[PDB]
Design a protein around this ligand. Structure first.
Ligand code: LYS
Length: 241
């Protein structure tokens, strides 16, 4: 169907009455397509709450993770909410909001496998393209091979199939994958490889929208909306401390 690409200021957005939100749709329980193929998750609930507070109809676009920030800067959407940890490198190309959650990257292996970064000496480590996991895997010494996947759930599948020794992913993502697939007795979560603060992105320089997102997120944090949505997905409050 195609769409009109434009980096829009908040005033232009407000004038149209709708806001375009980019996400991935392959990172359960943050953003994913459910069993009746509808987009949902923590970040989808958060984005819709933000849109509602701002008085705007949300329009969601799911696309592959590796080009979300690319297509954001090209004008495909107004902001992205797709679990991006804030990094110096990414901040050169997009502006981040205040983080909407805090989390960490974690080692996951089959029951007898690697627990610590040092255990990764000589091992095959699967990670998703363009992630902070692939960043940290490239910097852990003595890994035999970093295998990079287009989608995070496919790295998990290669771990289950015994084609890699370890999968590095988000701690909440690993937690829920194991539960929902009943792999408590087959997978083992190891140590936290790093910690990160995860934020929404807008196109480099889009301060007016950045301001409006930061104001809405603060209100959701203060008025109880954030707390309900976090409790809904995690049974705990995941905001940054
Ligand atoms: N939090 C990680 C993963 C993002 C989502 C990848 N499916 C990162 O910032 O790279």
């Amino acid at each position: 169907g195609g769409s009109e690409f434009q980096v829009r200021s908040f005033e232009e957005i407000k004038r149209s009455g709708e806001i375009r939100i980019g996400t991935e749709g392959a990172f359960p329980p943050f953003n994913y397509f459910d069993e009746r193929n509808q987009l949902t998750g923590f970040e989808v609930d958060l984005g819709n709450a933000i849109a509602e507070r701002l008085g705007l109809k949300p329009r969601w676009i799911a696309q592959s993770f590796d080009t979300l920030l690319i297509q954001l800067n090209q004008g495909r959407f107004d902001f992205v909410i797709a679990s991006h940890g804030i990094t110096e490198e990414r901040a050169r190309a997009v502006d981040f909001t205040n983080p909407h959650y805090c989390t960490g990257g974690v080692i996951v292996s089959r029951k007898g496998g690697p627990r610590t970064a040092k255990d990764l000496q000589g091992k095959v480590v699967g990670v998703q393209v363009g992630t902070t996991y692939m960043e940290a895997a490239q910097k852990i010494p003595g890994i035999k091979e970093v295998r990079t996947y287009q989608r995070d759930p496919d790295a998990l599948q290669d771990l289950l199939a015994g084609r890699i020794d370890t999968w590095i992913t988000d701690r909440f993502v690993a937690k829920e994958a194991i539960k929902e697939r009943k792999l408590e007795n087959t997978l083992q979560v190891g140590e936290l490889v790093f910690q990160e603060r995860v934020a929404m992105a807008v196109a480099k320089g889009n301060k007016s929208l950045l301001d409006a997102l930061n104001r809405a997120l603060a209100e959701l944090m203060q008025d109880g909306t954030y707390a309900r949505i976090s409790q809904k997905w995690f049974g705990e409050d995941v905001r940054c401390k």
